[PDB]
Design a protein around this ligand. Structure first.
Ligand SMILES: *[C@@H]1O[C@H](CO)[C@@H](O[C@@H]2O[C@H](CO)[C@@H](O)[C@H](O)[C@H]2NC(C)=O)[C@H](O)[C@H]1NC(C)=O
Ligand SMILES: *[C@@H]1O[C@H](CO)[C@@H](O[C@@H]2O[C@H](CO)[C@@H](O)[C@H](O)[C@H]2NC(C)=O)[C@H](O)[C@H]1NC(C)=O
Ligand SMILES: *[C@@H]1O[C@H](CO)[C@@H](O[C@@H]2O[C@H](CO)[C@@H](O)[C@H](O)[C@H]2NC(C)=O)[C@H](O)[C@H]1NC(C)=O
Ligand SMILES: *[C@@H]1O[C@H](CO)[C@@H](O[C@@H]2O[C@H](CO)[C@@H](O)[C@H](O)[C@H]2NC(C)=O)[C@H](O)[C@H]1NC(C)=O
Ligand code: NAG
Ligand code: NAG
Ligand code: NAG
Ligand code: NAG
Lengths: 394, 394
């Protein structure tokens, strides 16, 4: 699998950005640049002014003053709009959940790598030092096997030095978990808000049908005021959806560039590109460190086996500690296999692709469908309102 | 993440399976059992008889012979039903797509493992034999360096022997790809069929509104016949959804058991359990063979480097051969890191959990919502039909 820009993303990237004072700005995704927020704020103003133009248009129609066919058409358009809105809200929720799961999996992988490195270095320092110190006086009589103890100690120091070269993912873990919590809050509130909007739209459609059903004038004022409120709400929803869609498409155009120049200080660019691209040829930055770790572990097991074969027949007083060393080395080699499984680019690359498909493919499609909902609902309510003057003639 | 049985799965596991002759049959998921298949067939007959009872009920009502309120209620129930049906169809499609993606990624991982093993063994046999045979005559003047060549040859033999011990996933690739193609065909056809059913139901609702609108009797016969056809179709859909939901729940209760006795001959049980459970404490079955491979590779590079340090300054007859050996061994260690990354239980365990969540969590929920669609549409059309005798009074 690989990431290619879909047609909707590249087309929405072409939307011009002019900002508040209508000047060309750098189109590239860059939150925190005061020009960028103004450019996104301009798109909201376009819909806000479009609401003002629409509000005057419908009011003037009520001032300048087959009707059942227009009412039925308005109801049909409202039902189609709310159906499309339900579909779009579900799709946006799916995209946000995909992003949440991808971030959770990346957080778990980084936590696993960090825990493996920390546990391995802590064990190889503390427990190995303790056991060697305990067995040193036993081997103090014999100078050989005691040179070998120093050899093991120095190569354990080499292992710790090599392991310390691996990047620390403590900050990345915190960033990922806090951003996941933030997106959880935002997604829950947004989904609840759109569900409430859909329910209110359906209730207003039912009241609109009841108004002609019961021929009550007092209900007409309530439905009209609620329709105006829902109209302004739907125009605000259209503005928000347009801004969010253009921002998401702009980010989706250059996700690699964005991640490269956000995670530039905390994470080295070498491993950043390694995980972002996951080249199949090789050149993994961890290959040399893992090779050194595995070579050192293998030779340590060789010397410990030599101790077990020869020293135990002579110095059998306390050799269960050598068995403990063997347990330690076997567990450390299992941890080595786990570590080289985690640090591969395959899993994190799959998570990153899943996140992109969540926001670029499903999230953007859902946002576009929600914008279509907003526009269709606005048109339907405007048509219902302008048909009102001859609707209340009874 | 871990798999726990949801409430709907365990509740649907308690549906009584009695077969054709109403004899208690085992509830364990076994599509190859003739009795079990009859139990699913019995569930379809329950709805089929329920269709017969419903058909007589509505026919008798037309024989024994506010109406606009009943018609409006029927239309509202129809609209709600088709909305729920759209939601359920989308959810089932999402679940099937999740299953497709999990199977595809598992296929890719198995293909990667197989390709890595095959390439490594083919290279370590053919290229080692060729290069050593080419450089043997050069080293013919010294029995030393030839003892080393023989040692390298025997260790390459050990490497290929250890690598041959890894399981062959050729059959598993066939099974996964053919099942993915089959589920693609089935899901495409099923989604198209339900989309067509929803569209026809909406068209019939529109025609129902038009018939009362235009007061045309000739349209009433067409809407009644189409309603009867859609009624029998919806009852068949309910039968299919109930049977499929029961089968999926039966599988989802014991997925581990099902996979254990479906994949029993082609794949050994220990690795199947390792990939199904992915225990962090339990030693991986590939740990010993990967350790042997890495030890042999490191020692081989040790002898090759020793040769480069001593044979090259003295002989210098051919160095590109040893340089090619070093390229080969570096590439083989990169392949080793890739192999130990792929064979970890983490990736395939995540794939299996994703597939389970696709069919157990999303697929079954979508199927239940489609069954709700079928029942609601049947009730709505029955109510519309029984209101017809006083509807056509004009
Ligand atoms: C992201 O991973 C970190 C681990 O680095 C998780 O932090 C742990 O969270 C659990 C549950 O809250 C605590 O019991 C641990 O003490 C935490 N460990 C550390 C080192 O802080 C974190 O919960 C994960 N976040 C998400 C959203 O999955
Ligand atoms: C650590 O693992 C090694 C490798 O398995 C153990 O070495 C023994 O190897 C022989 C032949 O491969 C077999 O008897 C067993 O695989 C191992 N012995 C036992 C008793 O399991 C080594 O023993 C392990 N460490 C300890 C303390 O047992
Ligand atoms: C499952 O993996 C196998 C590889 O083991 C894929 O088979 C290859 O497909 C490509 C694409 O046409 C062919 O060029 C190769 O010749 C195939 N190899 C073999 C050995 O048949 C298969 O396409 C994969 N299926 C899915 C659905 O991903
Ligand atoms: C295969 O990889 C090894 C390990 O990197 C190469 O050995 C050299 O190691 C030293 C110290 O780490 C460095 O100069 C380079 O990493 C390696 N040398 C070169 C010239 O790259 C070994 O050279 C590699 N094989 C070949 C044929 O270059
Ligand atoms: C934004 O600025 C960067 C660097 O100055 C430049 O490479 C890029 O072309 C600019 N893009 C636009 C749309 O101005
Ligand atoms: C990241 O943003 C900075 C800030 O303007 C910019 O200078 C840099 O070029 C960007 N990174 C890339 C790869 O363009
Ligand atoms: C099915 O058979 C197995 C083995 O005979 C048994 O353990 C299980 O309880 C049976 N299931 C039912 C529902 O009787
Ligand atoms: C698989 O099916 C056989 C035959 O019915 C049964 O004996 C066995 O118990 C099943 N597998 C498991 C793990 O129970």
């Amino acid at each position: 699998v690989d990431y290619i820009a879909p047609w909707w993303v590249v087309w929405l990237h072409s939307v011009p950005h002019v900002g508040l004072r209508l000047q060309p700005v750098n189109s590239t995704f860059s939150p925190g640049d005061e020009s960028y927020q103004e450019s996104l704020l301009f798109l909201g103003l376009v819909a806000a002014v479009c609401l003002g133009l629409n509000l005057i248009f419908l009011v003037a129609y009520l001032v300048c003053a087959c009707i059942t066919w227009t009412a039925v058409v308005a109801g049909l358009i409202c039902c189609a709009a709310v159906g499309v809105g339900f579909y779009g809200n579900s799709e946006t929720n799916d995209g946000a959940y995909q992003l949440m799961y991808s971030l959770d999996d990346a957080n778990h992988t980084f936590s696993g790598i960090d825990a493996l490195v920390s546990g391995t270095t802590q064990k190889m320092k503390v427990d190995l030092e303790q056991h060697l110190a305990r067995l040193s006086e036993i081997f103090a009589a014999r100078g050989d096997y005691l040179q070998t103890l120093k050899f093991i100690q120095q190569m354990a120091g080499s292992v710790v030095v090599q392991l310390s070269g691996l990047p620390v993912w403590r900050e990345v873990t915190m960033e990922l978990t806090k951003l996941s919590d933030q997106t959880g809050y935002v997604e829950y509130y947004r989904w609840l808000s759109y569900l409430l909007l859909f329910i209110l739209d359906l209730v207003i459609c039912l009241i609109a049908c009841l108004g002609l059903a019961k021929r009550s004038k007092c209900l007409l004022a309530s439905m009209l005021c609620c329709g105006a409120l829902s109209l302004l709400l739907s125009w605000a929803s259209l503005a928000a959806d347009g801004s969010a869609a253009v921002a998401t498409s702009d980010f989706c155009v250059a996700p690699d560039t964005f991640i490269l120049n956000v995670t530039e200080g905390q994470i080295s660019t070498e491993v950043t590109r390694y995980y972002l691209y996951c080249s199949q040829s090789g050149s993994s930055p961890f290959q040399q460190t893992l090779t050194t770790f595995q070579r050192a572990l293998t030779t340590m097991q060789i010397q410990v086996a030599g101790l077990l074969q020869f020293a135990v027949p002579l110095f059998s007083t306390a050799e269960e500690d050598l068995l403990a060393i063997q347990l330690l080395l076997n567990s450390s080699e299992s941890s080595l296999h786990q570590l080289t499984a985690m640090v591969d680019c395959r899993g994190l690359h799959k998570d990153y692709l899943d996140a992109l498909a969540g926001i670029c493919y499903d999230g953007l499609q859902g946002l576009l469908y929600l914008g279509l909902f907003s526009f269709l609902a606005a048109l339907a309510f405007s048509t219902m309102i302008c048909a009102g003057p001859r609707a209340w003639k009874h």
